[PDB]
């Protein structure tokens, strides 16, 4: 069941039962952490770093190899951005829909989906305010929206 859609997908990952590093992976945790460091220096989200490590380097799961997950490694090194990844992408999508609605005035479908994206942004910001990742006075504004991205 999707949160704002009538669909009910089952598309998701399935981790194996084996939590151990495979034998053929001849990488220490240190080299994997350094690879994460250079990918962050290129400038990417933790999801993109995980995908790049999965596809090309044979690292099936970073937290089985290093013992920590990617954004924590970034935050301990100091390369994590100030606003979280999913919230940043939600704001960017809302900004794109805002630009399209400033272009086209009669599009009601865009207005409806814009309302949905704003609601997702508010719920995620409420969660990050509870967990003290965002500042408590953080707020999403219609006008000062593209300044964050």
């Amino acid at each position: 069941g999707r949160m704002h859609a009538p669909g009910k997908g089952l598309s998701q990952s399935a981790l194996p039962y084996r939590r151990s590093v495979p034998t053929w992976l001849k990488l220490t945790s240190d080299d994997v952490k350094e690879q994460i460091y250079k990918l962050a220096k290129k400038g990417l989200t933790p999801s993109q770093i995980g995908v790049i490590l999965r596809d090309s380097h044979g690292v099936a799961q970073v937290r089985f190899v290093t013992g920590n997950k990617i954004l924590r490694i970034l935050k301990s090194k100091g390369l994590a951005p100030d606003l979280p990844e999913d919230l940043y992408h939600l704001i960017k999508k809302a900004v794109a829909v805002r630009k399209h609605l400033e272009r086209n005035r009669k599009d009601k479908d865009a207005k409806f989906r814009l309302i949905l994206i704003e609601s997702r942004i508010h719920r995620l910001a409420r969660y990050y305010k509870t967990k003290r990742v965002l500042p408590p006075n953080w707020k999403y504004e219609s006008s000062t929206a593209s300044a964050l991205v």
Binding site: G1, L15, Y17, R19
Partner: protein
């Protein structure tokens, strides 16, 4: 969404008892579910079972005998003092001769007669007969 995993487990066990199946798969598992099924086992009602450990919430395969008539959860978990347990075992149990209110107390999860013996009260979880 899914709440009350004990309710899911007891419902699936009942619905396979009415169809007369030999084994039931209940997912997800819990400590509360395991203590409940243990209580149902020690009175010969449910039978011997397995806990499958996937690294998430596990699954349980329960071997069934044809003995269970009704397996039920009472939700919410009402606070049951010992003075008001009699009204509960009048409302839920089919006889004074058999059937069980499972309740959780600070001595553990038990049935109502053991709570009478141990002189405690608790919260109602279910009943089975």
């Amino acid at each position: 969404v899914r709440m009350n995993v004990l309710a899911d487990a007891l419902k699936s066990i009942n619905n396979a008892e009415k169809r007369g199946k030999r084994q039931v798969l209940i997912r997800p598992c819990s400590k509360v579910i395991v203590r409940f099924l243990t209580v149902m086992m020690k009175h010969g009602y449910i039978g011997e079972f397995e806990i499958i450990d996937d690294h998430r919430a596990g699954k349980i395969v329960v071997n069934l005998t044809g003995r269970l008539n009704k397996c039920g959860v009472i939700s919410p978990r009402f606070d049951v003092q010992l003075k008001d347990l009699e009204k509960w075992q009048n409302n839920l149990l089919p006889s004074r001769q058999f059937g069980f209110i499972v309740l959780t107390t600070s001595a553990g999860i038990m049935d109502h007669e053991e709570a009478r013996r141990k002189h405690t009260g608790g919260k109602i979880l279910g009943f089975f007969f």
